[model samples]
Structure formats: C-alpha cells, structure tokens
Target chain A: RYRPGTVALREIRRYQKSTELLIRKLPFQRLVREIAQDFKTDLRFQSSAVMALQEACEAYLVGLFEDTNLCAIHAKRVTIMPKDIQLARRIRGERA
Target chain B: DSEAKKLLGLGQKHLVMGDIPAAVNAFQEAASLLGKKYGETANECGEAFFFYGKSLLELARMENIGNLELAWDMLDLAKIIFKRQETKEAQLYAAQAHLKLGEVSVESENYVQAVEEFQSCLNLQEQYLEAHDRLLAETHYQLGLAYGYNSQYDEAVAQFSKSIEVIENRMAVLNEQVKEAEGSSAEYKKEIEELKELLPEIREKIEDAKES
Candidate 1:
C-alpha cells in the first residue's frame, strides 16, 4: 500500500533553487501524484517519473502566467483578470 | 445519450483545467458516441463535434502530436451541421468554427484561406451582433492582419479602419452612459480609456499598411 506523503522542504528547496520555481515542492508533488492516481489508481510512480512530471507542470505554469501577464499589459492593465487568461489561451490557439 | 453528455461534461472540465490529453480523450469518446447515436450529420452531434474538434486542435498543438488535419475535419463537420439549421444561434456557432479555421490557416501562413474564413466569420457576426460589438472589432483586426500578410495592403488598411470605427462607436456609447451616470462611472471610464489607448496602435498599423 503506497501512501501519499509530502516530500521534505529541504529536498524541494534544493530542486527549486536549481530551477528558480516559486511553487513549493510539497504541494506541487502532491497535486502531481493526485492527478496521476486519477489516471491509474494502485500504480506506483518512479522518482524519476515524478520529477519529470513536476518539471513539465512547472514549465507549463510559467509559460501560461507569462502569456497571461502579457495579455494584461496589452490591455494597459496592471492587474491580471480572468479575461486576460482567456485571451492568452486564445492567442495560444486554445478555443475561446 | 446520457453517457455522451457525461463525457462531454468531463471533457469540458479537463479542458478548463488545462489537461489537453484528458480533454481530448473524453471529447473523442463523447463525439464518437453522439456520431453513432445521432448520425454524423445530425444536429444533436454538433456540440460534441465542436468540443471534440476544439480539444483536438489543442492536442495537435502539443509536442509529439500531429492531429491538425483531423482537427480541421472535425471543426468543418461541426460547421456544416450547425450551418444547416440556419438559425441565429446555429449561425453564430458556425461563425465560431469559421474563426477557428481562420486561426489555423493563419498559423500555417495560408493567408488566402485565413482571409476567406475570417470574412465568413465577420459576415455571420455582422448579421447577429450589435454594430459596436467587440467581437466585430476583433474579427476585423484579425482579417486585417491576414490581409496585410497576403500583401493586400489596401484591404488591410480598410479592415483596420473598420476595426477602429467599431471601437470608436463602442466608446461613444460608453461615453453616453458615463454622461448619464450621477457618480462612480469608473467602469465605463476605464473601458473608454482602454479603447482610447488602442487607437494609436491601430493607427500605427494603418501607417505600416500604407507604407507597404
């Protein structure tokens, strides 16, 4: 029986220091494993697999936020809104 | 039928959560179910096809995925089914499909096809939307970009001007509302300011169009 547990902050900080991530490693890995379980319950994830998934997810979040910020700037607003996220997604060729 | 609807709901949730693969899987199942139950051409299948196509489009944009051709076919099928109804809502959906087709064409640098699809989208929107609708301005701006890319500088300028005109009309309406308000017209004022800022950029585009 594999149980979901939060990874140590020391380990997470080491990875974050290298990658310059704003997100905490504990919550990040927690969500990753949770979603993985949605696709396959009772399945075990390798350490390498979890790390790779975390990196991919982090990259996506960074890109999405950067685009979302640009959209807000284009609208001459300093604050990001739901509409800005919507526009950013549309610009990235996602359906409106 | 309920099963298909469930899949559609699941797909939509996945899409909103940015899980493109999961969304595609759910939408694909829903679309297949609807296609089998209602026939491919039936109106009941239109929603499924539209979502399936949208998710496919996103999936095609991902690395290691190359389903662009299939995505185009699904969206076109949805367009055809919706267009058959000839109702305002259905036509709007057709317009949305056309807009996506135009965007895909633009991505591939097929400016001529982009122009055609965007023009069709604009035509449908003009019939249904208010004259000052922001969508009209957006479509015109997109069409202008396609025209400019295709080296139809004059048409590009015309479309850009139309976009500006639409925005100006919208501002005018907002201004009127602001004038009538006794206090706290911040919302309308903010929109008017945003529109005002957009004018200079549009003008710059016109200048570039003329210079080319």
Candidate 2:
C-alpha cells in the first residue's frame, strides 16, 4: 500500500519548487532564522528544510499581501497601511 | 431595576478601567434588561445608550470602521431621546456622543468632517459651559488637530492657541481646588500630565505648518 504522507511531501517539494515567489530568498531565510530562535532551537536547517520553509513563507506572505491590498482598496486608500496589515492578519489567522 | 443599576455601575467601572469589550457586554445586557422592564425613552434607557455608545466609541478609536458607524448610530439615537427629554445631564451625554463621532472622523483621517463635528459639539457645550469645560478643552484640541491635517495652518495655529488658552484657564481654577483637597491631588495631577504631554505634539504641529 502507498503511503499518503510520503506522496504529499514529494508533491509539496515538486509543486512548491515550481511556484513563482514574489518574496526574495535571503529575507525569507532571515525570517526562518528568527523563527528558529523564537522556538529556542540552536540546530541548523538542512538545505531541504530551508527550501521548504522559504516556499511556505512565500506562499503565506503572498496571501497576506493580496489580502492587505484588498483591504486597502475596500477602505478607498491607494496604499496599504499598518491597519490593513493588522486586519488581514486577524482575518487570515492570529499566527502572524 | 436594582439588577440593571448594579450592571450599569459595573459597566462604568469597567469603562474607566479601559476594559471596553467587557464594558460593552455589561452595558448591552443592562440596557436590554432595563429597556424590557421600563420604556425605551426612560431616563435609564438614555443612560444605557450613553454608556453603550461610549464603549463602542472606544472600539472605534481602534480604527474599526464598523464600530465607528455603529457607535455613531447609537449616539444619534441617544441624542434624539435626550432632546425629547430636554434634561441637562442627558443633553451633556448626547453632546459627548457627538464628540465621539468627531473622534471617529479624526481617527479615520477625514479632518474636514472632524472639524464640522467639533463645531457642533462646541455649540452644544456653549449652552452649559460649567459642566463641559474639560470636554470643551478637548474638543478644541481635536479641532486644532483636524485643522492642522487639513493644511489650514493659520486656522490650525489659532485653534491650538485657543486650546492652550482654555487649558490654562482651567488649570488656574484647578489650582484653587488643589489647595482645598483633603490629601487627594490626583485630579489636577492627571490634568497637568495631559497638558504636559500635548505641548510637545502642539510644537511639532506648529513646526509642520511652518515647514509646509
């Protein structure tokens, strides 16, 4: 029997690598570093793990940016303010 | 009646402590219970609207547009009720609710709209100058801010100066009361802190006007 977990991980790696990212790799690496520090973990990331996190962060931030842009548009503002980011964060999840 | 009064008391205490959501809940329940027992136009009903509207005003200050509109509607309802009764206290609360709407305008960055709201509030406060001194002072301060942001530098400076004048006059009266206090100097102390706090901002605004 085939395992769904293994198939999903392979699918994620393949699909995520091909996805277009608006965010840069270096900044996302720094974000991953900060997140690791927040968890109190001293271990270094495997290149594979960093790539996975970079892909994940890109996807998340693109969603947030789009959501915040919509919020700005809804408010009749041309630029996204801090409040828009805050509302988008609330609507998306409390994680950010 | 007693239960509603107790809830109202609790709501006000929560409001003073800055727990807005809790205060809103308390005020809502009290207003609902009291409204069912007594008529909607009762004195207690207006009082409940006053507190409930204030709670929503606090939320509106957090930049939530929905809360601002809802607060305005509640305050508008309260104003009509108060005007029908024609009592000084209810009128004062109604004016304060209007001030809350002005605050919403200020927070939303619609400075011109804020100016209109503050002007109306000033007219209301003019009728009962004794009770509305502090509120009047604050209204002038906000009016100055609105004028500043609207780039009416001349008018802005004038309004700011007026706020300073009002605050100083009030301070003179507070000073006399301070000496009469039986060990509680907290009222004037807080008032002095507010004056001290805003002086820097007022200076910055003046500089901004000059630069512009």
Candidate 3:
C-alpha cells in the first residue's frame, strides 16, 4: 500500500560504508550531481541530496537483507549466499 | 582578542557570501568562546552574540518551526547580553534581537505579542536612528502582518503603506543603477521585481483584513 513513514537520516547512519556507502560508490553519482546542478544553476546541494539518496539506498538494503535472510533460513542454511539474494529478489520482483 | 576578532571576520565573510549555515556555526563558536572568556556584558561577547543571533534568524530560512523556537531562545540570550553593553552598536544588536523575536512570535502564531515586539523594535530603531536598511523595511512589513492577524485593519493598512513606501524608495536607487547597465543589472532587477510583486499581494491582504 506504500504507507509513508519518516526515516531520519541520522538513523540511516548505522548502515554506513556497507549499504549507504556502497551505493554512493556507484560510478554515476557524480553524473547525478551534475544533472542536479544543471537543473538549477543557483541551488546549492551541499551534500543534502546526496545524503538523502544514501539514506534511501540504506533503507532499501535493509529491506533486502530481511528478505534474503528469510530466504537463507527457508533454505536451511546459516549463511545468506548470493543465490539466496537472487531468489529473494526474484520473489520480491526487485532488480539491480 | 585577535583570535576572536578573526572568528568575527570569518563569520562576516561567510555571511556576505550567503553561506548562512556556515556563518551561523562560526558565530556560535565565536559567541561561546567570547562568552566564556569575557562575561556576557563584555563588548566582544555582545558583538558575537549579536552575529550569532542574526545568523540563527537567517538559518530559519532553511528550518522548520522547531528550529525557529531554538533560534528565538538564542536571540533572547543575545538580547540580555546586548542590554548590558550600553553602546550604540549594542543597541542596534538589541533592536535586531527584538525584530527577530517579533518574527519568531509571528511564526508561532502569537500575533498580539508579535505586535508588541515589533513596536519595541521600531522604537529602538527610531531612537538610535541607526541600522536603517532592509531590516527596518521588513519590520514595517511584518508589523502589517501582525496587525492584520489581530484584525486591526486600519493599522494593518497603515503599516503596509509605510512598508511599501520605504521599500519603493530603496527600489528606486536599485532601479537607477540597473538602468545604466545591462548584464550587471539582472540580480538587482530580479530583486526589485520580486519586492514589487510582493507589495500588491500585501495590499490584497489589507483588503482581506478589511473585509474580515
């Protein structure tokens, strides 16, 4: 149903470097910043949009982790393998 | 003393550059140090507190109601510090604190109290006859809003008239400058246009106040 909830960016800090940091390491992040700059020449980014995007990516990673963890448990394995994640993504209809 | 003065210079540089958050942080740091080394009554403390308070008000541009309250608290402390200094500059600081407090009062929906604060602000400004700039122009504008909110239509329209008169007089100088040039005039033209656009709506507000 897509009920909206408030997610504090400070709360998102807990998943840094592993989830949020990884998405920011994506090659196109600079392109995204450049595009934003072109969209509004006078608007200052000052890490605000980047930080919010990182937080959203962290939220997605946390949601994906729960599904993949359950997939591992259902497969009777202690470790969550890449196959488990792929299967979870297939079931949840998510993609890279 | 030099270090604190250096911080003040840095804060002012950030302020003029329109880096409001950075200026606020700089002023906060300077105020803390000055307040600790010298009492709140000290000249440096008053100056730093004034900058800190003004920056806090500017910071409210990017913040919510909660931030406004926090800014008001700091301005209250700044006003107290400014009261003890007894300098013309200190009085200017005190006037600005009242002006910002009046703004906060309006933001919080305390229109009656906002009126009192703004009136106090006007008294301070007129008494000292200093810091006569856009700030004083804004005071009359917001005082109009306060009066409108309190259902004082006559006074509301009067304040709006005063505000418009002051702003238009300032706009005339900007217009005179912009007319001489082409590309260098864009910023001033846009600013003048914005203020001109805003005044009519305020005039409409006076009409609404009259009707209601």
Candidate 4:
C-alpha cells in the first residue's frame, strides 16, 4: 500500500508515457551497494531489500520536492530555485 | 617559519577531519613556535595565533572554560597585530578576528561584550567592504541579536534595519544586472526575489525589537 502524499511508482509511470521508470532501478541499487561497501567490504543485499530501499528513497525525494515547491509558491514564484530548496531544508531542520 | 607553517597546515587538515584535539595541539605548537621566534606582536605570528584561537574556540565548545580564555587571548593578539598594518587585507583579517571575538562572547552569553566586538567588526568592515556586502549584512544582524539580548531594543531595531538595507542594496545591484542582461536575467531575478523574501523576515524582527 502507498502512503498518502507520496508518489508511487505507478503514479510516476502514469504521468509519463515512457515505459522506463522515473528512477532506474539498476543504477540506484548499484549506488546503494557502493555506499554499503564503505561500511563492510563483504556484504550481500537481497533483491527485495534493494527494491524497498529504492522505494523509500523515491518517497523521500517526492516529499522533499513537495516541500520545496511549497516554498517556491510561498515566495510567489512559479519556478523552483536552489534558494527554495535551501529554505525547505532549513525548515526541515537539516544541517547546513 | 617553514615548520610553523607546516604545523598550521596540519592543524587545518585535522580540523577538517573532525579531530579537534589534534588540531588544537598542532595549532598550539605552531603558535608557540612563531611567538618564540618572532615575538607575539609580530605580523608573522598573527596567522598562527588566529588558527590557534580558532581551534581553541572549537575546543571550548567541547566544554573547557580554560580553552575559551586562551582562545580569547589568541584572537585578541591576532586582532591587534592585524590592526596595526595599513593594507586592506590586514584590516579585513582584523575584522574577521573581531567577528570571531564577537562569536566567542555570544557563546559565553556575554551580550554586552558581543555587541562591542561586533561593533568593532562593523567599523573595520565598513572601511573596506562595499555597503552591499554579505559580511556587512551578517555583522549587522549579529549586532542586532546582541543588542536585543542585552535589552537595547532601539539599537537592535537600528541594526536590524541596517541589515535589511544592505540586503535591499544588494537586490538593487542585481536589478541593475537584470536590466543589463535583458532576457538572460533569470538567475539575477531569482536572487532579487530571494532577497525580497528575506526583507520581510528582518522587518518582522525589527517590529519585534520595537515591541520589546
């Protein structure tokens, strides 16, 4: 089941006519594996675990974008700028 | 001088790696070497003292009052040495030292001292930097905070207004760029819009200070 206010893979695919996913699964999983190697050289990830991580990361990005868009709108601008993202990050209490 | 400079480099590397104690030790050695060779008041020793003070300040944040005092002394020495030189670069260094001193005072909850240090920073900065410089705006905002905390609401309002004015001046400069660039002015317009958004918050701060 998809969480409210989060963009699901299906919804993303629906928005675009292309069959390719919004986030390429193989590249993201490769990135996760590369990051994991820093903690331990010898590590194995189940296919299901990689898919779950990808979904979580995508959801997080969607939420962050929504906040960033809101920040742009509050500034009375239609275009999203880097400043809007910075402000959104600040509001989210992320470190500088 | 070479060895002292090497030590300074080591200290900065350690600092970037989050090794505060190692950084402090390296900076202290560099400062001591420079101080012993060229005397504490020498211009050559100024950079060593500044780095030592910066590392000490970081250490003080880890809960050492002794480190705080030592940091203050080192920074003050750097400030004095830098202030004696006639160059704009030296003056800017002095301004930075003053800014750090103000930060140290603010960290220790001495708002009165913080205000004095920030004022000194502003004085030096104004002589060298453009009116629309971000550093000037930052100093004004910091000075406003110190004044507000010290119960000088009128001064706080004034400083806050100055901060907003500096930002508005920057926006005006960007507007000029926008006019010159014509259709390719998206980036400049975005920055101007961001500055416009910032002004209201500072004005709100001014209003709060006035009410207080």
Candidate 5:
C-alpha cells in the first residue's frame, strides 16, 4: 500500500512546476509575484493533506499495530517536536 | 529577514487561501523591513505606516486566542510610529489598536479594561465599514465567549449575538470566495478528496496510514 498524501504531493508538484516555469520566463516583478503566489497557496494545502493522512494511520494503531512500538521507537535521549506519531504502547506486561 | 520573507511569501499564499497565521507571519516579515530602515529610508514615515500597521493588525488577531502580551507589544510599536509621523490613517490605526487592545485585555482575562476599549470604539469609532463590521463582531463575540466562560451570561448573550450577526455575513462573503476558487483546481484539494474517498471512516491519518 502507498503511504497517504502521495497524490497531494503530485498535485503540489504540478502547480509548483508550473509556477516555477512562469517565474523563469517572467521579467516583471508583478508576474514573478503572481507565480510565487500560486506556488504558496498550493503548499499549505499539500502539507495539510499529509497531516490528515498521518492522523488516519494513528487512528488505526489500536486494531492493526496493537502491542507494537508504533511510537515508542527507542532512543537513549529523545526530544520533543510537532511530529505526528501514533500513540502505541508496548506490551510491557511486567516491570518486574 | 530573507527567511522570514520566504516564509511570509508562503504565509501570504496560505492567507489568500484563508490561512490566518501564515498570513500573519508574512505581514510580520514585511513589517520588519520598515523597522530595518527606520528613519533612514526615503519614505520612512510611509514605510512605517503602510507595512508595520498591517502587521500589527495581523498580530492583534491571534491575541484573542493566543499570546496577548506579544500582540500588545506589536500594536504599541505600530501606534507609537503612527503617532510620531501622523500618517493619513493615524487615528484610524490608533483606534483599531486600542480596540484590539481591549479585546485582547478581555481575552487575557481583563474584562473591565476590555470594556473600556470597546467603549472607546463605540464612542466616535471611525467610518471604517468593512473593518468595523469584521472586527467588531469578532471582538464582541470573543468578549461574549469570555463572559460565558466566566458565567457572565448577560454580557455573553450580547457579545454572542453580535458574533452571530457578523458570522452569517462573513460566511456568505467567504462562500463567494470559495465559489470563485472552485477548489478542484487546487492540487491539495484533489489529493485530500482522493485520500478521504480511499481512507473511508478514518480521519485521513497524517503520518501512519498506508494506502493501496
């Protein structure tokens, strides 16, 4: 199965490419600005698409990745960030 | 501020598509340009008034939801400059700044002071129809929500109704913008739509889903 938001990436790329091409040909600042404007508009929506897909995968962790370290991928010293991680808990039946 | 500019350009792009903070960031970066050449640029006064004021308003927006102190600082800086040179929109921006200050005061848990600001707006507030209509409803709604949250039902009712009055109108305006865009031309929308159709009953899992 393909990771979600792949198609979003393609669409964003499509618009991004078009915008870049226009920027390359355009001499007028206004024209370049117009291209940039289009590019930026597509980028946010493209990012959100990925975010939405990530949440969907997190939703299914309970049934599919049960007992898996979906998010507890081990590290000695971890830091916090805004990354979308599934809240999976390891099957630690004992702390003894 | 090149990085900020790049981000802001992107921010404005998001803004045009209805992304608030993204728009805010762009405005902030653009405003920073004025501060950089403050008092040195050919149009120093014009620089401050045009871009800086715009950013201040953008920063003011999130105050009702997030950081009031920072919002106040941004507004204060803009007001000081606006007053110094006395631009065309001097009083206009000042009034808005004060109005926002009050709304922010209320948001930051200062209802009484907020009322004072709102009263100022009520007392000879300028003839800024679009701005007055847009922000008044928001300020009042936020005031009301704050009131409701604190058990001030009477004030809350008044503010909430004010919010409703604008919300329906704003929605109509927004709907027209949406209709103009036709969201299908957007790459993001098509991707989102396909993902939703394929990933039925799921929340469009952002980082964890694999689709065939």
Candidate 6:
C-alpha cells in the first residue's frame, strides 16, 4: 500500500506502457522521470517508505480551483520544515 | 590463544582473497573468542563491528543495486554493537549503512525515505567529512531531481545549484584523493558527471509530469 508518490506512479505506468511498446526499460531513465516522486534509495522489499510528499501536495495545489465546496483549508495548513518546503518548491516549480 | 589468532589470520587472508563470506566467518569466530576473554577492550568490539559491517557492505555491493535488505539488516546489527561503545568509527559505519539504505530506497522510487536516510547519515556524524560532503550533495541532488521531474523547473535549478556546492566540495577533495582514488573513483566520477547532464534536462521536463 502507498508505493511511490505520483511521479513514480507516472513512471511505472510509463514503464509498463514502454514494455508493451517494446521500448528499452531503462532504470536511470525511468528513475529520473520518477525521481521527483522519491527514490527507494535503500534497497528494500515489501513497501518503500515515502510520505507521498510530492503527490499529496501537488495534487492539492493544482486542484485548488477544482471545487471550493470540497476543498478543506485545514488540510493545507499542516506544518512542513523549511527544507521540506524548499523541496516542495522544486516539485511545485514555485520559484522564479 | 593460538586458535583465535589463527582465525584472525584466516579472516585477513580471506579478505585478501576476496572471499567475504569466509572472511566474515573467520572474523566472527575471532571476535567471539576475543569477546569472551576481553570484555573491556575496545579493539575487539571495534574489530567485530567494523569488519562485520564491511562484510555486509561488500555483500550489498555484490548483489543487485536496488534492494539491500540483507545488507541493511547486517549493517544495523553491526551498528547496535558499535553504538554500545559510543565510538565515532562505529558511528561512521552506521552512517554508511543508512546511506546505503537510502540508495536502496531511491532505487525503488521512495524519495522521502531516501532523503530521510541520507539525513540520518549526516546527523550521526556531522564531522565525518565524507558523510558531510556526500549526504549534502545527495540531498540537494535528489531534491533537484525531484523538482525537475515535478515540472518545477525553477525549484529544480535551485536544488541543482545547492547540489553543485556540495558536489564541488567533493571534487576539491577528490581531485587530490583521486591521485590516490582507489577503486570507488569510477562510480564517484560517474555520479558527479551525471549531475551535469541531469540539470539541463530538468528545464525541459518541468511541465511534462502533468497531462495538461
């Protein structure tokens, strides 16, 4: 449950699609494409331990205008470390 | 006494032979005997912890790049023994174990865990020059990669710049160490080189993560 964040999901889907299309399966290529999501980093099994940091944040930020009725402002207010916020900037492209 | 010394000698020979498994067993036997007789000596404990970790890290190296569960387990166990003595040398290995674990997580696409593990490595031994340099570089590099893929070009660039600072620091040291770089140099060079190629591409991938 809760594997890679969104970028990883995209990469995996792309990887499966690539396999279907006979595209070369490249770990670096695939991993870099999904790197914005998170890397397993340590070789592990069963489940990769990621907080789904990018996936959740991006999903909400991009979807802020989707439905005012469904939006919960309280959820957006959760505290994040400055470094984490810096990381979020990279994922969100909020910088210049 | 002779038997323990013999095992220790055996362990050294096996390491020279690149027979890590055998070496580990030999060291373990030696360490066990030493432990029984000399509970207060840091040397025995250090030897056991250090070589056991070296064996696990070697084992990790020989296996697949992504999943190092066996490697991590062994290293963690080694860490517990080392921490009992509060030795920086032991802590250094523990930090390496975390760093290796972080790499494993990154391979599986777990960015959060990757950063945390790298950070853990840094926390344990801030003065470990290599740890400070490498972990900082990786954190920035991973962050750069993360932002780049997420269509956050500006943020990615910033991370890349931050990564460059650490990367540059490493190179400053490596430029010298490389004259005596030993074997890990190839990988070190490649990783650092990859950072160069990685940055430019992020500018392009910034908007691609989304279908719109």
Place model 2 in a CAPRI quality band.
incorrect
Candidate 2 C-alpha lDDT tens digits along B1-212: 88888888999999899888888888878877766666555555777766776787786665452565555555555555675566677677767766766776666565555676687777778786763276676777778778877778788777777776777777777777787888878888787677768667766766676675
lDDT of 6 by residue, B129-210 (tens): 5532656666655555655444556766665666666666776566566567777667656665665565454434333423
Write candidate 5's Cα lDDT for B146-193 as tens digits. 555445666666665555556456555554555677644455444444
Task: Give the CA lDDT, 0 to 100, for residue B76 in model 6.
Answer: 44
- Predicted structure with the largest DockQ when compared to the true one: 6
Off by over 4 Å in 1: A1-96, B62-66, B181-186, B194-204, B207-211
lDDT (tens digit, per residue) of candidate 4 on B1-212: 78889999999999889899999999988887887777667789888888888888888787643565667777877887897788999999999898888777776776656787898899999999988897898899999989998899999999999999899899899889889885676998898888788788889999999998
Q: What is the lDDT of candidate 4?
A: 0.79
**Predicted candidate 1 versus true structure: per-residue lDDT over B1-212, tens digit per residue:** 89889999999999999999999999988887877777776799788878887887777666442355455666777777787787999999999888877766666566756787799899999999999988899899999999999899999999999999999999999999899988757899899999999899999999999999
In order, the interface RMSDs are 20.2, 24.4, 18.9, 28.7, 21.0, 16.2
What tens-digit string does per-residue lDDT give for candidate 3 at B68-186?
Answer: 55556556666656755778877878888888777766766656557877987887877886332566677887888899887787898888788777778768877887998777959
Best by TM-score: 1
Ranking by lDDT: 4, 1, 3, 2, 6, 5
Give the per-residue Cα lDDT of candidate 5 at B149: 49
* CA lDDT, candidate 5, residue A24: 21
The 10-residue segment with the lowest total lDDT in model 6 chain B: B65-74
Q: Per-residue CA lDDT of candidate 4, range A1-96, in tens? A: 001112211111111111223577888888989989987787988989987787667656655675797797676897889998888888877885
Which portions of model 5 show Cα errors greater than 4 Å? A1-96, B1-11, B16-25, B39-67, B83-88, B124-139, B149-151, B159-212
Lowest summed lDDT over 10 consecutive residues: which window, candidate 5 chain A?
A11-20
| Candidate 1 docking classification | incorrect
Reference-based lDDT, residue A88, model 3: 78
What fraction of the genuine interface contacts, i.e. the true contacts, does candidate 4 reproduce?
0.00
**DockQ, prediction 5:** 0.01
Which segments of candidate 6 are over 4 A away from where they belong? A1-96, B1-18, B27-43, B64-70, B84-90, B101-114, B127-163, B170-212
Highest lDDT: give the candidate number.
4
- In the predicted model 2, the residue pairs found to clash are none
